[PDB]
């Protein structure tokens, strides 16, 4: 319900946060399940508008 | 003063809004990408059109 409440600007901020986690790899492995579940749920909700967006920073971040 | 028509998609739940004010997510109609979180006043259901006067201001909680 929380991840459904937040809007798309905060979705983008969330993706930037997960990028910073992947750079801080030990947080990633210590909290690997939760991060995966939240990321996949946010993208499954917001897939339409996120794929509507055209942004090379989004492309590189998601890569 | 251009009014915009948006389309209620998802009636948000577990958000604590005041009695009689229901939060909602809308997709723009003339542009099939953008989504905006807004508040309504009466009875509202999914997939139905809503008239926005000030289109860019995203809605916050009402405690």
């Amino acid at each position: 319900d929380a991840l459904m409440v937040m809007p798309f600007s905060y979705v983008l901020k969330f993706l930037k946060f997960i990028d910073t986690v992947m750079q801080n790899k030990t947080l990633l492995h210590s909290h690997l399940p939760l991060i995966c579940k939240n990321l996949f749920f946010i993208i499954k909700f917001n897939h339409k508008e996120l794929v509507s967006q055209k942004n090379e920073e989004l492309k590189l971040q998601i890569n | 003063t251009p009014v915009t028509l948006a389309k209620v998609i998802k009636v948000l739940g577990r958000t604590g809004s005041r009695g009689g004010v229901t939060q909602v997510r809308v997709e723009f109609l003339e542009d099939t990408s953008r989504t905006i979180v807004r508040n309504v006043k009466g009875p509202v259901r999914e997939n139905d059109i809503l008239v926005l006067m000030e289109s860019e201001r995203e809605a916050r909680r009402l405690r």
Binding site: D1, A2, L3, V5, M6, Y10 | R14, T15, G16, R61
Partner: peptide, 11 residues
């Protein structure tokens, strides 16, 4: 007291 969702948004 902000709900979950609101607290995640502020943080």
């Amino acid at each position: 007291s902000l709900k979950a969702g609101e607290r995640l948004m502020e943080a």
